Design a protein around this ligand. Sequence first.
Ligand SMILES: C=C(C)[C@@H]1CCC(C)=C[C@H]1c1c(O)cc(CCCCC)cc1O
Ligand SMILES: [K+]
Ligand SMILES: [K+]
Lengths: 255, 255
Amino acid sequence: KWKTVLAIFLLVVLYLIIGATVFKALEQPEEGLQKYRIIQEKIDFLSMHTCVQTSELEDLVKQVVLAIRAGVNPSGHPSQESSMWDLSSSFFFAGTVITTIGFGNVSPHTEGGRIFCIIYALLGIPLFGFLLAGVGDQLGTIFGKGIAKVEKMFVKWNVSQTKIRVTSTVLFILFGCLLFVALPALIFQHIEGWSALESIYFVVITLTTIGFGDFVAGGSEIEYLDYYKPIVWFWILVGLAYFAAVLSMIGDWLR
Amino acid sequence: KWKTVLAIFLLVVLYLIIGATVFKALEQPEEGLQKYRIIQEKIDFLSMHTCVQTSELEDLVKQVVLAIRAGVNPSGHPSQESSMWDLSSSFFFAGTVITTIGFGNVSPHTEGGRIFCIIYALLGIPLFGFLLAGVGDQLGTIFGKGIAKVEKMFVKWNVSQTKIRVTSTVLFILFGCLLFVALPALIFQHIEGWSALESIYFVVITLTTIGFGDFVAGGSEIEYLDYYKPIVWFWILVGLAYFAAVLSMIGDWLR
Ligand SMILES: C=C(C)[C@@H]1CCC(C)=C[C@H]1c1c(O)cc(CCCCC)cc1O
Ligand SMILES: [K+]
Ligand SMILES: [K+]
């Protein structure tokens, strides 16, 4: 019904308004303090060296931010051997493109690169969706067979059959979340030296296909080896397949 | 069958390998040239001002990159009034979070904001998905009725009705794409002053929900119209609803 659709739309609008207000209130001071700090640091450095011209310093900072947007780190002197568009890195980038994650830490800069990226995404996304649906359906069929094994009126004390089904689904999703969210969060927390909050935020963002780009699996050149990019892409695929299977089972229960 | 699923998996692996190879081959020279350019510009800046120590220069570059990761504009002096986390930008950020776009030009740096960002995404993504599915279902139903009407009013003799339906559906797809890609491309080619290739790249990324972040509707502090971010998000919403309805009709015909 059109009225129901408009009611849902208005609810979404109210949710967005509330989220915008709370985000503004919970972020304004941080960036205010950062602006104050960078302004006072720039003034102190200009007073430190009278030789440096302020316009020249601004030109230098402009070139630094241009290089940052290009995708090369100016703070560390590059040896050109650790190419950012490495073969494993390119494989990870293509995997994220077809997965609709889009971290954006590395982006194509050539015009032909942009055209090829557009064509590649438009061709690959339906194929990846088809594969994900197939694997999720396979895992859902296996889980349904497991539930049919569970439905035996035994080792449940006959409390409530609906409670038993709900408990089985909850245990399945809990075990899957523990296997594919918390444990990879700990692994990334140890490997990348981040905090637990940072690692769990990275895992949630990556799996939910958001891809903010503030935290990337490969960054700051700390010698990721043993095909780190292929295995992290494989973990992404397995987790997404599991979540798709759980969603398919949930849709089966709802309908 | 699981066998053809594994075959599709091998096809996806091959596609990713080919894409990675082509991307690396295309994007090596740009990063190489940028590395050499930044190295030679830093040595030139050291030559111009012998007072500056190279370690202090790299420290200043490190501070600039840290401010870039913070989200403020390092070049020039950021005005205190120019709060990046204002109402309109927060509304756009919340909309992109629920839509799963995830551009990444802005992100909650405060730990409290991060926790709320995780909870907000987890709650809002299902609601926006349900709203999009409902709007797509309604629009697809009226599309099917209208296409059946115009099919059985204009051409009814000496042809195949399936071919007529396919041709009319392709015509509608093309017209909707031209009204939802080319016209926004021109609008962005005026307000944002991007080249036509950049505008179509931005539209393709935005509607696909890749969300690279190299191009953002509101950025560079170039000044925009009142509540430009909400209206551009509304454009995103409309385009996504139309394309979801079209794909639903295509799936209905396929089924
Ligand atoms: C045409 C694409 C690429 C689809 C469908 C239409 C639009 C506007 C966006 C895309 C999209 C996802 O790519 C992924 C999800 C959620 C996946 C969750 C997996 C756990 C939703 C979702 O709408
Ligand atoms: K997405
Ligand atoms: K993204």
